[PDB]
Ligand binder design. Structure first.
Ligand SMILES: [Mg+2]
Ligand SMILES: [Mg+2]
Ligand SMILES: [Mg+2]
Ligand SMILES: [Mg+2]
Ligand SMILES: [Mg+2]
Ligand SMILES: [Mg+2]
Ligand SMILES: [Mg+2]
Ligand SMILES: [Mg+2]
Ligand SMILES: [Mg+2]
Ligand SMILES: [Mg+2]
Ligand SMILES: [Mg+2]
Ligand SMILES: [Mg+2]
Ligand SMILES: [Mg+2]
Ligand SMILES: [Mg+2]
Ligand SMILES: [Mg+2]
Ligand SMILES: [Mg+2]
Ligand SMILES: [Mg+2]
Ligand SMILES: [Mg+2]
Ligand SMILES: [Mg+2]
Ligand SMILES: [Mg+2]
Ligand SMILES: [Mg+2]
Ligand SMILES: [Mg+2]
Ligand SMILES: [Mg+2]
Ligand SMILES: [Mg+2]
Ligand SMILES: [Mg+2]
Ligand SMILES: [Mg+2]
Ligand SMILES: [Mg+2]
Ligand SMILES: [Mg+2]
Ligand SMILES: [Mg+2]
Ligand SMILES: [Mg+2]
Ligand SMILES: [Mg+2]
Ligand SMILES: [Mg+2]
Ligand SMILES: [Mg+2]
Ligand SMILES: [Mg+2]
Ligand SMILES: [Mg+2]
Ligand SMILES: [Mg+2]
Ligand SMILES: [Mg+2]
Ligand SMILES: [Zn+2]
Lengths: 70, 58
RNA sequence: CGGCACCUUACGAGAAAUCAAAGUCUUUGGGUUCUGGGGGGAGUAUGGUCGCAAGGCUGAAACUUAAAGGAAUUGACGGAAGGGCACCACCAGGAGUGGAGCCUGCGGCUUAAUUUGACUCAACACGGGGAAACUCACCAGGUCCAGACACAAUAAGGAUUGACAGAUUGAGAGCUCUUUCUUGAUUUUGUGGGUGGUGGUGCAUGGCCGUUCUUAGUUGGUGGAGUGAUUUGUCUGCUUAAUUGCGAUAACGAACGAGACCUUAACCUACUAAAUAGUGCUGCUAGCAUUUGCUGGUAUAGUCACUUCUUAGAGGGACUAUCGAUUUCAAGUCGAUGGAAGUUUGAGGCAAUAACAGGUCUGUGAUGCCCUUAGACGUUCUGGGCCGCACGCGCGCUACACUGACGGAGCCAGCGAGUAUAAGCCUUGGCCGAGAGGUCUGGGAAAUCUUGUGAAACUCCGUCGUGCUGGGGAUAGAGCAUUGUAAUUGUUGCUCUUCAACGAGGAAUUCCUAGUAAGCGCAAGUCAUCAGCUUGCGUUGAUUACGUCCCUGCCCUUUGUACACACCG
């Protein structure tokens, strides 16, 4: 019976931030060497090796188990 | 009397059908076997011949 | 003999109404004059003729149209007549409502929205609609897809989902934005197709319900009448709650509806039993007079008795029984007597033939179509509204006092409901508290416990003393608790204080005939809380008819009709 008119501008749902070959940045391969494991993989018992933190500012976050350090 | 109503789904609307069936009370096996106001009078058993005054010794 | 007519019948005529002519007419011919050829245009135009004129007589066509019309039938309607029934009509009355305050519903006004349906009976304490959240459909904002499935695009070198921390937000919604982590082909975009809607249409429907109407009405077989549609049966009268019966009778004999029927209430010292009912006895036990008595308590072992009450199943009992009057001596009615019951014994449930633009798509995973469908009219979260207030109206509750208010004391019902690992049911008893309420245990899934629901009116003894008074308790202030996440726009309860109109109500108008009306409370429903509401239940318990058609509605008969979509014609 009424025409719904909006006041706030239309919102856009968040889109997943694609990163091309993210796994390359987690490792530094040495010539005649081995894995680097440079991102400080999470130590929580839920997510073992291969699950890495996010070296963002003033904290290190891992998406599997939501916890932060320093 | 037993009754059954169903809705019939047609392309223009709904068709409602009611099927009322009255069973013969003479065949009823659990309730009354006749209508309440059905009075069944017996037949006259009279019109025998009466003989004056004997005694039949058995 | 001639007239003016009339009554009966229909040989006969007619489409019928009807007709002694409108008969002697397809079995068609006694004589003769005039007139008509579907409805309109139209008795019009034109010409003629008569007339002082008004007009008369004669009198077309173009064009237009599928009916117009006659008689009768059924129904509907009538500001036509005659009957009948009904406390949703009246008479005699009772209680009222309408006058006051308040509760609640409706309109209106207002609003950000104050969601909406309904408008005489048959809208307005109705949608079981007593809305804090939810309900919720409205308003201001914020999320999610819970968009199946075939495709196409994208896509592992990752299609996409969740997300700490800060900003943002009403929000500890990763809603979004900074932030780089995580998950891994379920999934992201477009196409179709969907799906979901308290969105629209009840004037597109089903189902249900209401209404006509719970009034008493409806129908066919055979026979009679009519060319037929139809009609009689189905009715003048009396009678009944009743188309229910008597009776009259071209009808006879039937069916549905009414009545029968079913549930409930009243009776049963007559059956059947009852420690989930009661009693008398008996044990044991208490108090008072001592007369051996009178009141109690206790007894799931006194391992008693019984069914009077209580419970419920099998029956019995009433059928107007008997007797008087009236009556068509019939149906019945009115009086008595007996009886538990003599108003259909009281009350309900069910309830015909068709039908309504009655109400609901806001009960349905009942539905067709239209609208919307991702910035949703879907769903969810937050807050507000449904309560909003110059007004008119309706359903009700308190009152206006002494046939009463308080204060003590007496102290009697019936219908019901009740839980578990819940999301908390009914809750006694003890202890706190002025209260409301709090706390600790126990009983009850129930004739066992709540509960004898020790309810209220009511009755007794006191104060008050005709005063807006100790009637009335609105409005408002402060405080104390309860329910709930949440009480602000007071949920509700309790304490103190505040002490309003109202001094019996105009025109009008509602309900009602016996355990009825009126008071008076109680339970169940809604329900976390809230009952001035409904659905029932019991306590106290009348006045006045037991009649009529004067008003009102409906039904029937006669009657008129140019209506039949039926007078909203
Ligand atoms: Mg004839
Ligand atoms: Mg005649
Ligand atoms: Mg004549
Ligand atoms: Mg003609
Ligand atoms: Mg006619
Ligand atoms: Mg009548
Ligand atoms: Mg009167
Ligand atoms: Mg009153
Ligand atoms: Mg309004
Ligand atoms: Mg309103
Ligand atoms: Mg309301
Ligand atoms: Mg809803
Ligand atoms: Mg809401
Ligand atoms: Mg909204
Ligand atoms: Mg309708
Ligand atoms: Mg016949
Ligand atoms: Mg015939
Ligand atoms: Mg008749
Ligand atoms: Mg008839
Ligand atoms: Mg009659
Ligand atoms: Mg007995
Ligand atoms: Mg007697
Ligand atoms: Mg009865
Ligand atoms: Mg309508
Ligand atoms: Mg009402
Ligand atoms: Mg008193
Ligand atoms: Mg307990
Ligand atoms: Mg009792
Ligand atoms: Mg007082
Ligand atoms: Mg006073
Ligand atoms: Mg409320
Ligand atoms: Mg209640
Ligand atoms: Mg209500
Ligand atoms: Mg009467
Ligand atoms: Mg009258
Ligand atoms: Mg007629
Ligand atoms: Mg017509
Ligand atoms: Zn981790």
């Amino acid at each position: 019976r009424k025409k719904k008119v909006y006041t706030t501008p239309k919102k856009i749902k968040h889109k997943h931030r694609k990163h091309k070959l993210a796994v390359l940045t987690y490792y530094k391969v040495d010539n005649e060497g081995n894995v680097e494991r440079l991102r400080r993989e999470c130590p929580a018992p839920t997510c073992g090796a291969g699950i890495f933190m996010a070296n963002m500012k003033d904290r290190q976050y891992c998406g599997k188990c939501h916890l932060t350090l320093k | 009397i037993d009754i059954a109503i169903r809705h019939v789904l047609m392309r223009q609307g709904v068709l409602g059908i009611k099927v009322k069936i009255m069973k013969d009370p003479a065949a009823n096996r659990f309730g009354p076997r006749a209508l309440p106001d059905a009075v069944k009078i017996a037949e006259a058993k009279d019109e025998d011949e009466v003989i004056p005054a004997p005694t039949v010794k058995s």
